[PDB]
Every structure is written in structure tokens, then in C-alpha cells.
């Protein structure tokens, strides 16, 4: 039958005071109720709408009833998003330790659309659910309807939102730049956010993090081992329960050269700490009272957290198996490489601990590799766990750095907390890179119509013009600055711990005050060293400036026929063959020289000049570890440890600590309760 409008029309000007711009579709008048197929729909009704072929029936809430100026009978509704209607999509079928997506759990949005009454099918009972009500007072309510929603979804930044100490667990902690930045920003916002625990399977990163944070319980192990260790630390906290012992040092689950199970490190009486030995529990069965003492005092000291002891969990799971740099990735199935599954392990630990806040960080290819399968996976794991969630992309250089590192950050917050915003850029940046089209709405940036005057985009000279000269072989971990800081960025990066609100060493100046740390470049072998020596000190100089190199047709390198193959002192060619082959012979990166006025898009774990522009502008060496950490905002006092390559890996895998610092300020504002409203973006105060 024909759909009809029911009841007297709304007052002419009342409808304009309610719907002004409706008077790009214009309306003759407005109504309140409408019948289609012998069922009356009033305003505010939740409605099922016919969709395309193979498309599920849309879900909407009616906002107007009006006849269009084209004599049509229109209705308009704002849509409910299914869990698969959001950016999650195919990963709506995943489950994390029990929790699954409820098929009856939709998400209200402010996205509106006008259609005709003929698109309407049947009513649907959708109840609004408060998570902060009695937990069993939500059950019968959910089973007394058809669909339910406890959260709103926003396309902007994929926001799932509701309608003073704090502990932080740093999973895959590395050297600790991300957790350090979070703590610094939270201290600026007025929150005592510390780092109580840190897990990383690389030993030198643990060394660095514990050096810069002595009170942090840094564990040199894997994340799955740590999760099983938490599981089998809980039951000892519940039970309280050849030689002789004096005390037990530590506890662990599994590990290298060991089988699954709980092990204790033992100090034997009459023997030194060098004779302390890792032992299983079935062989420590004759040592009950000392295990009781260990468990009791470690529980009182919170050496390991129980469910509820972690307020924030931050993570930087490995991107080596997701990055576009890895030309061996498996797009067909991403959860085959173990380094990709470490994100699943991370979210499993999040499920076990249930922290108030979650902050996962990765690179942009997590939203592109396997069409973003892993990234959305993360979001799904948060949505299936009833977490408020948010997804953003933040450029490092926009927060005071001479580098363009766009990173994806996943915020998560329990419904009892306030979902934290993303900090707007405080700096302009040299745009070097492209954001995905499917996540254009997740770029943390000012819109084009309004952008205040931001501080000038930092260049490389602003970061390294301060540092004194060093040679290819610089074996000194600690040295002195050749002079005073030149630029504002260098003055900020040379600030002490207390000037940067770093309370790791309490009051009083900590170690290495005013010293130049890790100002050591990668020591190239003699061949690469003299290859670098042959590169001219000019802007744009690279291997194409070496002897015997020519640029042929279509910017393709060739050999010079008139010049014989230039040979080094060792009997190996001056110009390597891979330099001639790279990027179908069209690359300027091999043995590239960077200059003071041109930025570095992304500092990486490897510092060889071979396939990147990493040679110092005026010195015959690659950029030092301290210079790369400066490009990523590490304060000069943050000392690294390990071999030179390992320190490079540490600063290249880290998070730019200005980025983490802005995130920490936003997190502190959300944690304390100081928030404006629905805006996912936040303008930072002077800092």
C-alpha cells in the first residue's frame, strides 16, 4: 500500500526552529508520524531500512518526518553502526580470551541520511545501556529488547565513546622512550604516572630502561612468558605458599634454555651472587617458607601486577613483520609471522590485566598491510572487550622534530574512564609521505580552514649543529659538548631531568649531568669508510658523484666507458654493484649525504649508508646514535647501552618522546577528569 503521513503538520515556524536548514533537500512541511504497510512510526523510533543486495538491513533512528518540495514522502534517520559496519569490518569474527562481539550490540552515530518511507521495513527495540549500572541489572534489560547500544561511534578517528598516582606497564618496552614520554607528559598534566614494569626480550634495551629508571621492574623476557608468569603468580598470591638458601632473588616462567613452568633464582647460603642459580619449583619443594616470604614481600612490593594493579598499559609491538620495508611479508595470512602475533599476545595480556587505559603504537602499514587486518584486529580486540576506543595517526615532526614519522596510536579506556583525545600539532612539518585513503579521517592534524600559527618546521641543523665533531671510530660512551647550545631545540634537548619533570632519580641531579652521551657513529669498515670519504661535501651528494658513474636515459645509472672501474685499496670496487642496481638503477639513497636544511623522513634500526641518506652533512661518517635519538626527541641525558648497532636499534624502534609526551599530557587530562567534551582533538598548552 501507499505510505502516508499521519496527524496534523507541525507548526510552520516550530518546524523551522527545529529544522532550519531543511527549510540540500527542501521540504514543504513537516509531520510527526508516518504509516507504511500498516504500521505507524513516530519520531524517535528505531527502524530497519532496506539496503543493497548482499547488504545487511540498515538500522536507523528517525529524526524528521517531512514531505519534500519534490512532492515526495521523505523520512530521515541517523544510523546505528554494527560492529562490522565500523572500520573493524571482517575482524568482527575474532575473539580474545572468551569475549566476542555481541550480534545485538550496535553503536549510535550522528551520520544522517534522507530516504523515502518505502525504505522502512519494521520497528526494532533498541535500548540504551549504561555500563556504570549494576552488572546484572543490564542482563534482563539486554534480553528485553532486540538490539542495544552502550556506546556511540564516530567516523572521525574511529571513536567508540560513552554516551594522584597511576601505574604503567610497558609491553615490548625497548629502551623506554614511549613510557618515558608518557610519564613526562602526565607529570606536566598533574599526574604521577610512573613505569612500574617493562618487558623486552632484548637485554641491552632492558639495560637502558633500567639505567634511566632504577625503580622500574624491568624484565628481560618475552611477552607470552610474562603473561604465563602473571597467571602463575596469581595462584601463589592466592595460596601465599643438595644445599640451603639465604634468600630468593626473582621469579620467572620458562625462558631461554628452560621449559614451561615457574622458576626461582636462588642465593645459596655460603655462596656469592655469582653462584646464584635459576631452579624449577618441583626441585625447590623443600623450600616452602622462603617461597612464602618471596611471594608475600613481592606482592606487598608489587613486583608483579595482579588484575587491577595496572592503570595504563602502553605497547610498541614489533613492526618488522608489518612494515613496507619488509619485502618478505605474507599478505595472504598476516598472523603467521610471530612478530605479527605479538600484537595478539599484547591484547591478551591487556585482557588478563584489564587496565584503565591502553595505548598501542605501530606504523602506518598496520592500516594497509593485509588491508589493515592487524590494525583493525587491535581495534576489534578493544571493542569486543567493551573498551572505549580511538584511532589516530600522528606525525613526529609536528611536535618539534626534524623528521616525518607518521605513527598509528590506538587509545583504549574502560567505560569508567574518559577516553583521551589526540594532541594537535604544535609545529609545522615538512610533509614527506602519504596517509592512507581509507583512514584519511584518522589523521591527527588541523583542518584546512583553520590552522593557527605554529612554530616553524624544525630542520636538521636545529638538531645537530650543536654537537662537536667525531670520527668514524668513536669508542667513548661519555664525552663533553664542544660548546653551548645554538638553537632552541638543542636547548630543550639539553634540559636536565628535573627541568623535564623526569622524577626517575627523585630530587637532586641524576647521573651524567651535562655530559654528551652515545655520540658515536656506526664504525664503517675501511672500504665503506673510504667510500664515504669520496662523497663530496655538498647538498644532494650521493654515490652518483663517485668516479666512473654516469646518469643515462630516464635517470638510470650506468658506468662511464672512458673511466675504468675505480678500485679501492682492498681490491673491491669503489662503487658497489648493488648501488648501481638499487631501485632499478634510479635511487639517490645509496651513500647519500643529508644537509642541514633537509629532513630525515624516518630514522631506522640500521645505520649503514648503503640504501639510505644517513651520512653526516660535513663529516666523513654516518649520523651518530645521539643524533638519531635527537631526531626522535630523546633528551640528551637518556643514556643507551650495548653495542653501537644495538643502540641504533633501540633509538630506531622507539617512539618519538615528544609524541609520547603529548600523549601523556592528554592521558593525564583524561585520567584526572579534566576534559572538554566530544572533540577527539586537543590543543596543547604552552610546553
Amino acid at each position: 500500500h501507499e505510505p502516508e503521513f499521519i496527524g496534523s503538520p507541525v507548526a510552520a515556524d516550530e518546524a523551522r526552529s527545529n529544522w532550519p536548514k531543511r527549510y540540500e533537500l527542501k521540504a514543504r512541511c513537516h509531520y510527526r508520524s508516518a504509516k507504511v504497510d500498516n504500521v505507524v512510526y513516530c519520531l524517535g523510533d528505531d527502524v530497519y531500512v532496506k539496503a543493497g543486495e548482499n547488504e545487511a538491513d540498515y538500522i536507523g533512528r528517525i529524526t524528521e518526518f517531512f514531505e519534500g518540495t519534490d512532492q515526495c514522502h521523505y523520512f530521515t534517520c541517523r544510523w546505528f553502526f554494527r560492529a562490522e559496519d565500523t572500520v573493524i569490518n571482517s575482524l568482527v569474527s575474532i575473539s580474545v580470551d572468551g569475549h566476542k562481539h555481541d550480534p545485538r550490540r550496535v553503536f549510535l552515530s550522528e551520520e544522517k541520511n534522507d530516504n523515502v518511507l518505502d525504505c522502512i521495513i519494521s520497528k526494532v527495540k533498541i535500548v540504551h545501556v549504561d555500563p556504570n549500572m549494576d552488572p546484572k541489572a543490564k542482563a534482563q534489560l539486554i534480553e528485553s529488547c532486540d538490539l542495544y547500544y552502550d556506546m556511540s561511534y564516530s567516523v572521525a578517528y574511529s571513536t567508540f565513546a560513552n554516551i594522584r598516582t597511576a601505574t604503567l606497564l610497558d609491553l615490548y618496552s625497548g629502551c623506554g622512550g614511549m613510557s618515558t614520554g608518557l610519564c613526562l607528559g602526565a607529570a606536566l598534566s598533574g599526574l604521577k604516572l610512573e613505569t612500574r614494569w617493562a618487558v623486552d626480550f632484548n637485554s641491552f634495551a632492558c639495560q637502558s630502561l633500567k639505567y634511566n629508571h632504577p625503580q622500574t621492574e624491568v624484565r628481560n623476557e618475552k611477552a607470552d612468558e610474562f603473561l604465563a608468569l602473571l597467571k602463575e603468580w596469581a595462584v601463589l598470591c592466592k595460596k601465599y605458599v643438595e644445599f640451603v638458601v639465604e634468600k630468593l632473588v626473582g621469579i620467572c616462567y620458562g625462558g631461554s634454555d628452560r621449559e614451561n613452568g615457574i622458576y626461582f633464582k636462588v642465593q645459596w647460603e655460603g655462596y656469592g651472587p655469582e653462584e646464584d642459580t635459576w631452579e624449577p619449583i618441583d626441585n625447590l619443594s623443600d623450600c616452602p617458607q622462603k617461597i612464602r616470604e618471596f611471594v608475600q614481600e613481592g606482592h606487598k612490593r608489587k613486583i608483579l601486577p595482579l588484575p587491577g594493579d595496572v592503570d595504563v598499559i602502553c605497547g610498541g609491538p614489533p613492526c618488522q613483520g608489518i612494515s613496507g620495508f619488509n619485502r618478505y611479508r605474507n599478505r595472504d595470512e598476516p598472523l603467521k609471522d610471530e612478530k605479527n602475533k605479538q600484537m595478539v599476545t599484547f591484547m591478551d595480556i591487556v585482557a588478563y590485566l584489564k587496565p584503565k587505559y591502553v595505548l598501542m603504537e605501530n606504523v602506518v602499514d598496520i592500516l594497509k598491510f593485509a588491508d589493515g587486518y592487524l590494525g583493525k584486529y587491535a581495534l576489534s580486540c578493544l571493542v569486543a572487550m567493551k573498551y572505549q576506543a580511538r584511532l589516530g595517526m600522528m606525525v613526529a615532526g609536528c611536535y618539534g622534530l626534524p623528521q616525518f614519522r607518521m605513527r598509528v596510536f590506538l587509545w583504549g579506556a574502560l567505560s569508567s574512564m574518559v577516553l583521551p583525545k589526540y594532541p594537535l600539532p604544535t609545529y609545522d612539518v615538512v610533509v614527506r609521505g602519504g596517509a592512507p585513503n581509507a583512514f584519511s579521517q584518522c589523521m591527527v592534524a588541523y583542518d584546512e580552514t583553520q590552522k593557527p600559527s605554529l612554530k616553524k618546521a624544525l630542520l636538521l641543523g636545529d638538531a645537530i649543529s650543536d654537537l662537536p665533531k667525531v670520527q668514524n671510530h668513536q669508542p667513548n660512551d661519555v664525552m663533553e659538548y664542544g660548546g653551548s647550545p645554538k638553537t632552541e631545540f638543542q636547548r630543550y634537548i639539553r634540559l636536565s631531568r628535573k627541568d623535564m619533570l623526569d622524577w626517575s632519580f627523585g630530587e637532586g641531579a641524576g647521573p651524567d649531568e651535562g655530559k654528551l652521551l652515545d655520540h658515536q657513529p656506526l664504525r664503517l669498515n675501511n672500504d665503506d669508510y673510504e667510500r664515504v670519504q669520496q662523497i663530496p661535501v655538498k647538498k644532494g651528494a650521493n654515490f652518483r658523484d663517485l668516479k666512473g658513474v654516469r646518469v643515462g636515459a630516464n635517470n638510470i645509472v650506468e658506468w662511464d666507458p672512458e673511466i675504468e672501474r675505480v678500485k679501492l685499496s682492498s681490491g673491491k670496487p669503489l662503487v658497489p654493484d648493488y648501488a648501481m642496481s638499487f631501485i632499478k638503477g634510479k635511487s639517490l639513497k645509496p651513500f647519500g649525504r643529508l644537509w642541514w636544511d633537509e629532513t630525515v623522513p624516518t630514522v631506522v634500526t640500521r645505520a649503514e649508508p648503503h640504501n639510505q641518506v644517513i651520512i653526516h652533512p660535513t663529516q666523513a661518517r654516518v649520523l651518530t646514535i645521539r643524533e638519531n635519538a635527537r631526531l626522535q626527541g630523546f633528551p640528551d641525558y637518556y643514556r643507551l647501552f650495548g653495542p653501537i648497532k644495538e643502540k641504533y636499534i633501540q633509538v630506531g624502534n622507539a617512539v618519538a618522546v615528544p609524541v609520547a609526551r603529548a600523549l601523556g599530557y592528554c592521558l593525564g587530562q583524561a585520567y584526572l577528569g579534566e576534559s572538554e567534551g566530544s572533540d577527539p582533538l586537543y590543543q596543547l598548552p604552552p610546553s
Binding site: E242, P280, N283, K290
Partner: peptide, 6 residues
């Protein structure tokens, strides 16, 4: 107390 040296 008492334990093993492995």
C-alpha cells in the same frame, strides 16, 4: 632451607 643444585 633445602633444595637442589641441578
Amino acid at each position: 632451607q633445602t633444595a637442589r643444585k641441578s
